[PDB]
Design a binder for this molecule. Sequence first.
Ligand SMILES: *[C@@H]1O[C@H](CO)[C@@H](O)[C@H](O)[C@H]1NC(C)=O
Ligand SMILES: *[C@@H]1O[C@H](CO)[C@@H](O)[C@H](O)[C@H]1NC(C)=O
Length: 388
Amino acid sequence: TAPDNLGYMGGGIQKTPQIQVYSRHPPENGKPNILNCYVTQFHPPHIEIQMLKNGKKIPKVEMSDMSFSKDWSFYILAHTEFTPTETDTYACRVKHASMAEPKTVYWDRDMGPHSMRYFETAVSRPGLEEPRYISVGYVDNKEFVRFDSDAENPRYEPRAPWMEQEGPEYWERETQKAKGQEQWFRVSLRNLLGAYNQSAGGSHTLQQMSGCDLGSDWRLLRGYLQFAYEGRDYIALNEDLKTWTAADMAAQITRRKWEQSGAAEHYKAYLEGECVEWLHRYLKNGNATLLRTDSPKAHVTHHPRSKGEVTLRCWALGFYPADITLTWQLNGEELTQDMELVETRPAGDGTFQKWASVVVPLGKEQNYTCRVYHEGLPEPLTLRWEPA
Ligand SMILES: *[C@@H]1O[C@H](CO)[C@@H](O)[C@H](O)[C@H]1NC(C)=O
Ligand SMILES: *[C@@H]1O[C@H](CO)[C@@H](O)[C@H](O)[C@H]1NC(C)=O
């Protein structure tokens, strides 16, 4: 169930994408596969991504829908069917305002327990009175509804199959709230443009995160309600659900207005009331799919580098949910950030992939162990380089 904001924001900077290109399955020449280009941590959300086979645009490339992470940054997965061979090369090319020129990345084949969230975004459009407004609802970090003002018939739509259980009055009620949010983001965007002495020629973004965490007994643990302007923290409701934290001077004015009108009480009532009750219903209705876990399959690869050193890479593949911890230790003693990680990445089939590497001296590989922590496991894994 989505929130309905009340008072508006008061009135009167980019992030470079990180790009991984990687196959879903371990590549074998002649064997069909999927190539992924996962683009994360960028802002603003407008981005152009192309996949290229031998320098030519690949015609059928799937793109995920606009999404952002808890740090406000946007991410996208593009992917395509492909059959690796010895001589074909593949790349992902990304154009984004943070970069003067498009960036081409070549595929280097050789390398509480429950929650609901509504992640909402409004992007102002230089010549149009109305921004684009997208809202994405999540249940246990799995997308379950989505609204996008750019659709031909904008409505909340089910994004998890079990949401077929809601009748028409549900979609209508939720859609009407999305329309109210659209108007609110529009007003706030305009107020913010004056609050910061900006001109309308530009594009600007306002984002919201709202929802609730529950314990394993399904009792409320914490509610959340926070906003970002231009991808930067603006104001957040504190954990008491009564007081606000303002990130800067503009946001303090808003905080003062909202304390005077008691806005926190309205959001408090939503977070502790409908947010919880509707999450209960969604937990029950989506029972069959929300319990699923996939244990990581882990192994260590061995990469001799210059000098007498080696890189050990500890891989975890095939796992769900995406939360995982990979650590390297030396004789049971863990290394305080000596190691190279990679952002966890979707394989595209519902599981995820991650690795972590350390540089060690040749001959001393057996002193190092990798440990994998994941809730799908019966217990944490311990592994080490295993030669032939
Ligand atoms: C979820 O499904 C399992 C397996 O059928 C069932 O035993 C359990 O009681 C269900 N729980 C809820 C909350 O629906
Ligand atoms: C590293 O492994 C070797 C060979 O198994 C072992 O003898 C040695 O004690 C280990 N080094 C340390 C510092 O524990």
